[PDB]
Ligand binder design. Structure first.
Ligand SMILES: N[C@@H](CC(=O)O)C(=O)O
Length: 465
C-alpha cells in the first residue's frame, strides 16, 4: 500500500498535474494498492488567505468576483491542459463549477455580514485542495485507471475543533478507503483538510498535506509513504546558502525530526511521528526528477561512519534573555514564563538555562518579540522589594539559530569542541548553546550577519570532508 503525496508546485499547472498522474499510474503497476494525497495548486491557498482577509475588510463584491474568475480560469486551464478525454473534462469541470459556486457564495457572505469565523476561514481555505483533487483524479482516469477524489473527512481523518491548526481525534482510513482500494480504485485524497466529529471542514495547519499523507499511511498500515516534492530529497543544508549541498540518502525518524524547525518547509515532526510509530518508511522524491533516489527515512538506522549528517538554519529569529536572582530554586517562574508565552501564542524555538538558575535564554521569531515582552509584563512587572521575581529582560535582534545534526554524534567525543572551534574560525561568536541529552542535535545562536560564513565553514568541515 503506497501513499503518494504531491505539493502545490507538483500540481501547479495542468501539464504538471498530468505529469503526476503519470507518476501515479506507473506506481500502480508495482504496488496494486495506491492512495494519492494532493495539495491545492501552488499559490491558491495563499490567494484564498488573502481573499479571506480582503472580504472581511474592504467588503467588495466585484473584487471577489474578479478573484472567482481568476480561480475559475486557472482551474479551467488546468483541466484543459491535464486531461485529453473530453468526457472526463466535462465531468471534472462540473465538479469545479459546483465548488466555485460555493466558494463565491461564502466569500460574498463574509463580505455581506462582515464576519470571518475560524470555521468560515477553514471552509474557504479548503477549496484549494477540493479544486485540485478532482482534476488529478480526472487525469488518472484519463490515463485509464479507476480514481475518485475524496475529502479528508470522507477519507477518515476526524479532527478536533481547533480550526486552522486542528489535530487528529481519530482515524477511519480503513473503513473509508479499503472498500475503494478493493475495487482497484485509486482515491486521491485532499491533503491539508479534515472533518470535525460533527462534520465541519477543518484544516491541519500550513504544510498539512504532508501530515495527511502520514495519517493515511498510518491508518492503512502502508508499506511506504512517498512525499513527492520539487527537490531531490532532503539536502545536507539549504542550497541557497551552500550550493554544493548534497542529497541525504538515508535519515532516521529522529534525525528527520531535529531537522524540522518551526516555520519550514521541511516535514514537521508531527508528520514523522505516525511513520516512526509503525515503522513505515518515508521516501522524499523529486516530482521534476522522478528517477533520483531521493531520501529514505527509516528505523533501520545503521552506523554509516559519518558523524555530522546535516546542518539546519533559522534566520527570522530573536534572542530573549530573562533574568533575576529572584528566580532560583522552587519558584514557579519557569512554569509562569511559558504560561504567559502560551497565552500569547508565541512559539519558543530554543531554551537554555545555566547552572545558576538566575537566567533563562529563549529564541523566538522576530515578529513575536513585542508579543512576548507584553506577555511577560502581564505576568510580571519588570527592584526586589516589589513582589516581582524577574529583574531584567533583554532582547537580542538580528540573530540566527544553527543546528548540527546526526545520529553519529552520540558517542562522538570531541565533536562539540570541533563544531564550535570551526564556528569561531568562521568569525562568528557563539551567543547561546543548547545540546539536549540525545546528542543528535547541537543547536546554537549567532548573529545573522555571520550565518552564511558559518554554515559554509561547518559544511566544508563536516559534510564535504
Ligand atoms: N494548501 C496547503 C498545501 C500544502 O500543505 O502543501 C497549504 O497551503 O499549506
Amino acid at each position: 500500500t503506497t501513499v503518494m503525496k504531491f505539493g502545490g508546485t507538483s500540481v501547479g499547472s495542468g501539464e504538471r498535474i498530468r505529469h503526476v498522474a503519470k507518476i501515479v499510474t506507473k506506481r500502480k503497476k508495482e504496488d496494486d494498492d495506491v492512495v494519492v494525497v494532493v495539495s491545492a495548486m501552488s499559490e491558491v491557498t495563499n490567494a484564498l488567505v488573502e481573499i479571506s482577509q480582503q472580504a472581511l475588510d474592504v467588503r467588495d463584491i466585484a473584487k471577489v468576483g474578479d478573484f472567482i474568475k481568476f480561480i475559475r480560469e486557472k482551474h479551467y486551464k488546468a483541466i484543459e491542459e491535464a486531461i485529453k478525454s473530453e468526457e472526463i473534462k466535462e465531468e471534472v469541470k462540473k465538479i469545479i463549477d459546483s465548488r466555485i459556486e460555493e466558494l463565491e457564495k461564502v466569500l460574498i457572505g463574509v463580505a455581506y455580514l462582515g464576519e470571518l469565523t475560524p470555521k468560515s476561514r477553514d471552509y474557504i481555505l479548503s477549496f484549494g485542495e477540493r479544486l485540485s483533487s478532482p482534476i488529478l483524479s480526472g487525469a488518472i482516469r484519463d490515463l485509464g485507471e479507476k480514481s475518485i477524489a475524496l475529502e479528508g473527512g470522507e477519507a477518515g481523518i476526524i479532527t478536533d475543533n481547533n480550526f486552522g491548526s486542528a489535530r487528529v481525534k481519530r482515524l477511519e482510513v480503513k473503513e473509508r478507503l479499503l472498500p475503494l482500494l478493493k475495487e482497484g480504485i485509486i482515491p486521491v485524497v485532499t491533503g491539508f483538510i479534515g472533518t470535525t466529529e460533527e462534520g465541519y471542514i477543518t484544516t491541519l495547519g500550513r504544510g498539512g498535506s504532508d501530515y495527511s499523507a502520514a495519517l493515511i499511511g498510518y491508518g492503512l498500515d502502508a508499506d511506504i509513504i512517498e512525499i513527492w516534492t520539487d527537490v531531490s530529497g532532503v539536502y545536507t543544508t539549504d542550497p541557497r546558502l551552500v550550493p554544493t549541498a548534497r542529497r541525504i540518502p538515508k535519515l532516521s525518524y529522529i534525525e528527520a525530526m531535529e531537522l524540522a524547525y518551526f516555520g519550514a518547509k521541511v516535514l514537521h515532526p508531527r508528520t514523522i511521528e505516525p511513520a516512526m510509530e509503525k515503522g513505515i518508511p518515508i521516501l522524499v522524491k523529486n516530482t521534476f526528477e522522478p528517477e533520483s533516489e531521493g531520501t529514505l527515512i527509516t528505523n533501520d538506522m545503521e552506523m554509516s561512519d559519518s558523524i555530522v549528517k546535516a546542518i539546519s538554519t533559522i534566520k527570522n529569529v530573536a534572542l530573549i534573555n530573562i533574568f533575576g536572582a529572584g528566580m532560583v530554586g522552587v519558584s514557579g517562574t519557569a512554569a509562569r514564563i511559558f504560561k504567559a508565552l502560551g497565552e500569547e501564542e508565541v512559539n519558543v524555538i530554543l531554551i537554555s538555562q545555566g547552572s545558576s538558575e538566575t537566567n533563562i535564554s529563549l529564541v523566538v521569531s522576530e515578529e513575536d518579540v513585542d508579543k512576548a515582552l507584553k506577555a511577560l509584563k502581564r505576568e510580571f512587572g519588570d527592584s526586589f522589594l516589589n513582589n516581582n521575581l524577574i529583574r531584567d529582560v533583554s532582547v537580542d535582534k538580528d540573530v540566527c539559530v544553527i543546528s548540527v545534526v546526526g545520529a553519529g554524534m552520540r558517542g562522538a567525543k570531541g565533536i562539540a569542541g570541533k563544531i564550535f572551534t570551526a564556528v569561531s574560525e568562521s568569525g562568528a561568536n557563539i551567543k547561546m548553546i543548547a545540546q539536549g541529552s540525545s546528542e543528535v542535535n547541537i543547536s546554537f545562536v549567532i548573529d545573522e550577519k555571520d550565518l552564511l560564513n558559518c554554515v559554509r565553514k561547518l559544511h566544508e568541515k563536516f559534510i564535504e570532508k
